[PDB]
Amino acid sequence: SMVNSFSGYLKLTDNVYIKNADIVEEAKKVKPTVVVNAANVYLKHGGGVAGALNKATNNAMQVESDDYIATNGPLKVGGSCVLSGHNLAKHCLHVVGPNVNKGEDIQLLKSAYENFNQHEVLLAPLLSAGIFGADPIHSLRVCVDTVRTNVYLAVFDKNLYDKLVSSFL
Numbered sequence: 001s002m003v004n005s006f007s008g009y010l011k012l013t014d015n016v017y018i019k020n021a022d023i024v025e026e027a028k029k030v031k032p033t034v035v036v037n038a039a040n041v042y043l044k045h046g047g048g049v050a051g052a053l054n055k056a057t058n059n060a061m062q063v064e065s066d067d068y069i070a071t072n073g074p075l076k077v078g079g080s081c082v083l084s085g086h087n088l089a090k091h092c093l094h095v096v097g098p099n100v101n102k103g104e105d106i107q108l109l110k111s112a113y114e115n116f117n118q119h120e121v122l123l124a125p126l127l128s129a130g131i132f133g134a135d136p137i138h139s140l141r142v143c144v145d146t147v148r149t150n151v152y153l154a155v156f157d158k159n160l161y162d163k164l165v166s167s168f169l
Ligand SMILES: Nc1ncnc2c1ncn2[C@@H]1O[C@H](COP(=O)(O)OP(=O)(O)OC[C@H]2O[C@H](O)[C@H](O)[C@@H]2O)[C@@H](O)[C@H]1O
Pocket: 021, 022, 023, 024, 038, 039, 040, 044, 045, 046, 047, 048, 049, 050, 051, 052, 097, 125, 126, 127, 128, 129, 130, 131, 132, 133, 136, 154, 155, 156, 157
């Protein structure tokens, strides 16, 4: 197994680590095999993690995503696809958490995190915890209870990070 340069992560469990950092800056520094995007089913990378990752690729992520959708159609809620990581990572795993704010079942967050188990090591965000409206601590707990591979979580928001790391899992 390869060794990556992830540094400054707090250990949560045997396989889950967390840091107060911007996922774009972590990806630029570490250049991991897999960075995870918190996507929507259309791969329209507007804001949050998706918009920030896409901007850092100079829109190449969006161009590639548009071809993916034209060929294959939307992803499923809880689903994923593997695309290029462009200048940020070898690959980007686009994963769709439920849009809880629009009535999608929060239970699909477990299905979303199951996609991570197909990859030995990932740099990832907390799925559904932003504009999709899932409680962030719930997303973290589902991640810890679902993902068995090595996941390095980048939490942009300082106040959120401080709360998450002093919560039970
Ligand atoms: N640069 C960042 N680095 C790390 N974490 C971040 C960053 N930006 C936001 N977060 C945190 O990452 C977490 C997830 O926030 P979100 O990115 O909204 O993802 P979702 O799954 O809820 O919504 C998906 C939609 O978001 C996009 O618009 C897509 O195109 C989709 O339409 C929150 O805790 C954020 O504070």
